[PDB]
Amino acid sequence: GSHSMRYFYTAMSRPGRGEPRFIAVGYVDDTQFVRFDSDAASPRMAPRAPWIEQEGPEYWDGETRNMKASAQTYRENLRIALRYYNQSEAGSHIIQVMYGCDVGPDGRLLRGHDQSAYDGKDYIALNEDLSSWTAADTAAQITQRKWEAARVAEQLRAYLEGLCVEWLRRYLENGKETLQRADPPKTHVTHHPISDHEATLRCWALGFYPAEITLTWQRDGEDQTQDTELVETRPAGDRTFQKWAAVVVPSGEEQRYTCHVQHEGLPKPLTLRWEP
Amino acid sequence: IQRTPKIQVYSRHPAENGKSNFLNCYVSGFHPSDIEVDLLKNGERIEKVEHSDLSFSKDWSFYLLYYTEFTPTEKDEYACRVNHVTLSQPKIVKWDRDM
Amino acid sequence: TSTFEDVKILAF
């Protein structure tokens, strides 16, 4: 299948309570493999997956150095952003960054990403061409001008096409037992009466990986999109994910409803019914 | 400017009384990142609770998993108690074995 | 490195 590597930075200011906190996590697909927290007793990039632990001291020294440099740069960016938005130094604010690469089955670059936000809103983003920028407002346009003048996009492009893809390929090989294994959902339908003339049918999906899944209800073969209650996909805590979808049906019509499940770990889509 | 947390409370494996398990409280969709989560057993805070590393979704909203090992019984009742700047007072979501 | 190294160029 295709695969992705993503790094996520969060920098959060807290006036009166020290310097901004910087946290960074790294993922391959839906598997976290490293973390960094500036509030830790002794901040270091640290392993969160067994297949990364084999990297040597030069690796961990390198990544730790990067995260301290990044913490410093985004602390300064919080101070800069304050001025760009004419804001007081009393409040707490947040910068977020997500970046990385996607590769196809053959391991070549599908596309790269480098996107930033301020207080939960888009700030600036590297365009898919990896050579121009999209700025969300006149503040981000000031940053865009600086980055254009310094040819920043060229350096990100070189990273995204080169080191990002090369490292992702290495991780996929070292973690092939798990990163390259899809676990299909375990599925069942439950039935619970609401009243004498209505019942809830809930379609469960359990123990699947990766997180991407489609659960749909049909009535007489017609999708019940606007009438289905769909809960957010949630982590089980053991690498896998869980989801359910529910529909309220008239008593006696339960067999007119079917649940359809799509997942990477399934050769063909599943169709389930309530089995009384 | 701010977004209130969605909360789900559930177990890692389907629950059976007397068999060891994990209790989860998944909070997501919230902003900013500061949040307070307690896991409760019969109204009392459980002490040994762990949580995942802060991360966020494509829409920039944050998510966290809080979890603790527990053995369900038919009597005992569990819940999650969450506070956030968007919340006037803590929200309590009870563990229902079928959701 | 695996993370992007030259982060100083990303001054706002």
Report the CATH number that the domain containing residue B14 is assigned in CATH. Answer: 2.60.40.10
AA identity, residue A104: G
Q: How far is CA A51 from CA A33, A54, A176, A199, B22, in A?
A: 8, 7, 9, 47, 25
Instruction: For CA atoms A56, A45, A31, A6, give the dihedral sign.
Output: negative
Q: Cβ separation of A70 and C9 shorter than 8 Å?
A: no
Structural domain of residue B90, as residue ranges?
1-99
The residue assigned the tokens 């740069």 is A73
Portion 47-76 of B in contact with A at CB < 8 A: 52-56, 58, 60-62, 65, 67
CB half-sphere exposure, A178, CA atoms < 13 A? 16
A98 Cβ under 8 Å from any chain B Cβ: yes
One-letter amino acid at A141 equals Q
Chains contacting C (3+ CB pairs below 8 angstroms): A
Phi-psi group of A71: left, alpha or beta (phi > 0 → left; psi -120 to 50 → alpha; rest → beta): alpha
Give backbone dihedrals phi and psi of A247, rounded to 5 degrees, phi first. Answer: -140, 145
> CA nearest A213: which of A222, A223, A204, A200?
A204
Q: SS3 for A75?
A: helix
Kindly tell me the burial class for residue A63, based on how many C-beta atoms sit within 10 Å of its own C-beta (0-12, 13-18, 19 or more).
buried
Please report where in the chains the tokens 């040819």 appear, as a residue: A151
The neighbours of chain B, by the rule of 3 or more Cβ pairs under 8 Å, are A
Q: Provide the domain count of chain B.
A: 1
> By the CB < 8 Å criterion, does A31 face chain B?
no
Domains of chain A, each with CATH number or no CATH: 1-181 (3.30.500.10), 182-272 (2.60.40.10)
A66 in contact with chain C, both atoms CB, cutoff 8 A: yes
Q: Which helix (H) or strand (E) holds A83?
A: helix A57-84
Identify the three-state secondary structure at position B56: strand
In angstroms, this model's resolution equals: 1.8
* Alpha carbon C5 to chain centroid, angstroms: 5
Residue in chain C lying closest to A163 (CA): C2
Q: Is cis: bond before A50, omega within 30 of 0?
A: no
Please indicate if any CB of chain A lies within 8 Å of the CB of B90: no
* Closest chain B residue by Cα to residue A189: B98
For chain B, how are helix, strand and coil distributed in percent, rounded to 5? 0, 50, 50
Relative orientation angle of helices A138-149 and A152-161, to the nearest 10 degrees: 80
Query: Which residues are CB-neighbours of B57 under 8 A, at least 6 positions away?
Result: B28, B29, B63
User: To the nearest whole angstrom, how far is the Cα of A117 from the nearest Cα of chain B?
Assistant: 8
b or e along B8-28 (b: 16 or more beta carbons within 10 Å of the residue's beta carbon)? bbbbbeebeeeeebbbbbbbb
